[PDB]
Amino acid sequence: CPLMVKVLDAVRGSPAINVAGHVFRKAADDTWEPFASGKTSESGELHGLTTEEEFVEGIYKVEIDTKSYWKALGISPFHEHAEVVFTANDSGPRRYTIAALLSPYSYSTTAVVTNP
Amino acid sequence: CPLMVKVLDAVRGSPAINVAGHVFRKAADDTWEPFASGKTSESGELHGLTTEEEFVEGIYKVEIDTKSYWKALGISPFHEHAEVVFTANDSGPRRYTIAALLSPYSYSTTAVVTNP
Amino acid sequence: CPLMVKVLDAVRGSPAINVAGHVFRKAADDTWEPFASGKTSESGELHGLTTEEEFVEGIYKVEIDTKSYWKALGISPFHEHAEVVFTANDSGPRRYTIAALLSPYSYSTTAVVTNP
Amino acid sequence: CPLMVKVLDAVRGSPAINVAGHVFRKAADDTWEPFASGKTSESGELHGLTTEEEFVEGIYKVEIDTKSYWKALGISPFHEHAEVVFTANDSGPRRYTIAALLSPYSYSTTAVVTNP
Numbered sequence A, B, C, D: 001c002p003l004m005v006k007v008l009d010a011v012r013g014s015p016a017i018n019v020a021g022h023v024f025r026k027a028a029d030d031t032w033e034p035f036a037s038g039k040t041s042e043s044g045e046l047h048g049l050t051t052e053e054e055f056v057e058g059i060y061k062v063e064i065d066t067k068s069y070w071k072a073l074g075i076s077p078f079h080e081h082a083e084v085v086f087t088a089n090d091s092g093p094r095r096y097t098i099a100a101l102l103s104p105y106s107y108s109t110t111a112v113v114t115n116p
């Protein structure tokens, strides 16, 4: 899996389960083309989004629906979502983990990029 | 100052100076309408973006040009930019500080929301 | 103010008010000698800890009583406290802001170091 | 493994490899007794620190030698180390992942605590 998304809850100290994630790729006309989507598992991880052959060079956007996560816990959070936009595979194929750490009024995101 | 943006550099341990930030309000057609912009000061701060009168309820986006910042420092960055999207003033007017802490492969954002 | 500590609450999106902070300097015997202390203000800030004269080179520790803060809010915390240990003034006197962003199961700390 | 430590580098977007970690447990006399140590693998993970039977209730300290990590990369970082202090197993045995995300002038730490 060349693209994985992991989401953690900094209030409970747990994986953030059942969080929707949507991936888009910038098209030649500069629009955001839907690329993949899913929801986080019990481990907070969203696997199986793409394959090495489909995950070509390009600019990708990962949008994590953090607002729905907090709202289901009774909380009205600050952010509408957490979005991560990045160029992928510019130097050849890589494996990307996009990790997000969520609090109601703050989030952090990191990328772990490895060479297979 | 109903809206302030502060940007910090976690590599140098300093304010992130001369970082462009652009503010948008979501339009009725779901498009992003540009609202205000500026460059961070020597303290990392972007002041004077809006006024109490103009900063009505709505969904707002702050886009921080983190890629140009890292490029100017000669450091390879992961993200194309950092975006913060939030609903403003849903329970009355508030003063918002959006703080962003930047590293080349990670960023975090927090909101400090105080009632005047 | 050679040394300032600022504490923010990522759950409420506010300064963390009335948080105790204690500052220590490492002694020749490697023990921690208490140096200064205070409680964060309504802006989350602990000012007036030390002076230019007293804040000589050395290794310093700031201990933030995060557990008492979360307990006062009725929220279960993970950490006993948050500690920040750093060598100060190794290349001349600097002004240090130690910023801590608190969640119940996570914290982050950053230093903003500026040369007067 | 009831206790795992994971360390990531936010500058390079990579696991932080070969980082020393030391674990201590608070003794009945209030001293810090050495409990386990190791170094992070190529995945940034330190496994095999303890067993469920040995990892009894108590207050534990995990000290990560972040300064040596940065110094080996040519960087003089702000922090001397990253230390995490927490009560473990107060409600029965749990599995703890202590994750640290490192930059030269900032770090963040989170706990992911799961029930086996």
Ligand SMILES: Cc1ccc(C(=O)c2cc(O)c(O)c([N+](=O)[O-])c2)cc1
Pocket (backbone or CB within 6 Å): B006, B008, B097, B099, B100, B101, B108, B110, B111, B112, C006, C008, C097, C099, C100, C101, C108, C109, C110, C112, D106
């Ligand atoms: C680790 C971390 C991340 C974000 C914040 C943070 O949100 C913040 C907010 C401020 O109003 C402010 O003045 C500063 N500061 O000056 O350093 C930081 C504080 C700490």
Ligand SMILES: Cc1ccc(C(=O)c2cc(O)c(O)c([N+](=O)[O-])c2)cc1
Pocket (backbone or CB within 6 Å): A006, A008, A097, A099, A100, A101, A108, A110, A111, A112, C106, D006, D008, D097, D099, D100, D101, D108, D109, D110, D112
């Ligand atoms: C404070 C912080 C923020 C983000 C990360 C982080 O990026 C990360 C990445 C992983 O692949 C991973 O498995 C975990 N984890 O399980 O805890 C965390 C690590 C620490």
